Amino acid sequence: QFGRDIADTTDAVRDPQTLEILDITPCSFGGVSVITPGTNTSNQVAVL
């Protein structure tokens, strides 16, 4: 019924009704950083 990765984490699951298997990919995430020169030069910023 389940699939697991080497890290013992759930990877794939089988549909109980139509017995098909679906991959489980987690939703995206990540850090946010702010780019800026000195405040004494401008107040513009760019984010990554």
Partner: peptide, 25 residues
């Protein structure tokens, strides 16, 4: 080096690279 490395003679770089070669939740 060789720009596209098209020569039959492989640089030591490729050998070392291949020798070293050989989550979102």
């Amino acid at each position: 080096p060789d720009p596209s490395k098209p020569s039959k003679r492989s640089a030591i770089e490729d050998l070392l690279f291949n020798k070293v070669t050989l989550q979102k939740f």
